[PDB]
Amino acid sequence: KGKCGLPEIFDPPEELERKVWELARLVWQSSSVVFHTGAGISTASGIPDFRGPHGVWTMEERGLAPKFDTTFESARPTQTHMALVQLERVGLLRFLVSQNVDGLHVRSGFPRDKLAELHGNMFVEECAKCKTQYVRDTVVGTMGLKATGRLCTVCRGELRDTILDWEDSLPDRDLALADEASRNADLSITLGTSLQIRPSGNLPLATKRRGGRLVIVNLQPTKHDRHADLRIHGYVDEVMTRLMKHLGLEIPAWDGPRVLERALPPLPRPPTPK
Numbered sequence: 036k037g038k039c040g041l042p043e044i045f046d047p048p049e050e051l052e053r054k055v056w057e058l059a060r061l062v063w064q065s066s067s068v069v070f071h072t073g074a075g076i077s078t079a080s081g082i083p084d085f086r087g088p089h090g091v092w093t094m095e096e097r098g099l100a101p102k103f104d105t106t107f108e109s110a111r112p113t114q115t116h117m118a119l120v121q122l123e124r125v126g127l128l129r130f131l132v133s134q135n136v137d138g139l140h141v142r143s144g145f146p147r148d149k150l151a152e153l154h155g156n157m158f159v160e161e162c163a164k165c166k167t168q169y170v171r172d173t174v175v176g177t178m179g180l181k182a183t184g185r186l187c188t189v190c191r192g193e194l195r196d197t198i199l200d201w202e203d204s205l206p207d208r209d210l211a212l213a214d215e216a217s218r219n220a221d222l223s224i225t226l227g228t229s230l231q232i233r234p235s236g237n238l239p240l241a242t243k244r245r246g247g248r249l250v251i252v253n254l255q256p257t258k259h260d261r262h263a264d265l266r267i268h269g270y271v272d273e274v275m276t277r278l279m280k281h282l283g284l285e286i287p288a289w290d291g292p293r294v295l296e297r298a299l300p301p302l303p304r305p306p307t308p309k
């Protein structure tokens with residue numbers, strides 16, 4: 036599905052630094068910062084993307100299977116995952132919209148009330164009856180919104196996976212929160228997504244339409260490149276490491292899988308430059 040296997044682009048060191056300083060500036064000056072993440076933020080942990088050079092669909096085109104260097108369970112959040120945890124803690128991230136099913140945002144300790152997982156989460160099952168969600172320690176075992184073989188404990192209703200199939204519509208609440216955050220954002224930053232899937236890929240444009248700024252961080256071209264105020268071509272982990280340095284923020288260490296349901300008030304953060 037969509038455009039697969041396009042050549043990657045790398046801003047050279049001085050181009051990159053200048054662009055990351057510009058991004059820092061946009062973050063400092065924007066009250067509402069919304070991040071939009073795709074499969075590219077998980078490749079540095081061993082999970083292949085879909086449309087990159089060895090992406091799932093690109094490889095399918097060659098009659099090759101995708102290569103994982105991890106199970107979903109033994110996957111570690113990347114520096115990028117952890118940077119987003121910290122940005123949220125200090126109040127420099129309003130909301131996070133993800134297209135990833137890998138479960139890494141949740142397991143990194145990102146508060147679920149500021150997270151929309153538009154395409155589902157491998158570790159989450161949902162009661163058909165009450166709609167209460169269960170975050171599990173291991174992948175649920177089914178995809179396509181199917182019965183997992185477990186009953187709810189809030190009820191005895193049927194538990195199903197939340198992995199959307201091709202024809203399946205997006206979770207009502209997640210999309211509602213994603214829309215609200217994107218329309219009301221001063222700044223949308225996309226990370227490691229080619230922005231080819233609607234409505235997910237068009238959400239960062241709602242920010243642009245409403246007068247806000249748009250930053251696209253990606254190794255390949257994306258569908259909405261022409262609409263961005265800043266395009267940054269580099270490994271996300273590098274882009275984020277440099278950004279956090281400029282912002283004067285530590286990237287916290289991951290202590291293993293942890294679920295946080297609700298965000299706290301912002302922690303102290305350094306003062307803004309002149």
Ligand SMILES: Nc1ncnc2c1ncn2[C@@H]1O[C@H](COP(=O)(O)OP(=O)(O)OC[C@H]2O[C@@H](O)[C@H](O)[C@@H]2O)[C@@H](O)[C@H]1O
Pocket residue numbers: 036043072073074075076078079084085086087090134135136154226227228229230231232252253254255256269270271272
């Ligand atoms: N370390 C990295 N740093 C920066 N960019 C990266 C990195 N690794 C990969 N990328 C880029 O990330 C992008 C990932 O885009 P896709 O593979 O299309 O993944 P995504 O946009 O998340 O896909 C959207 C949706 O498509 C469906 O197949 C599936 O439902 C998925 O959630 C690619 O353009 C690739 O160049």
Ligand SMILES: [Zn+2]
Pocket residue numbers: 162163164165166167187188189190191192
């Ligand atoms: Zn129930």
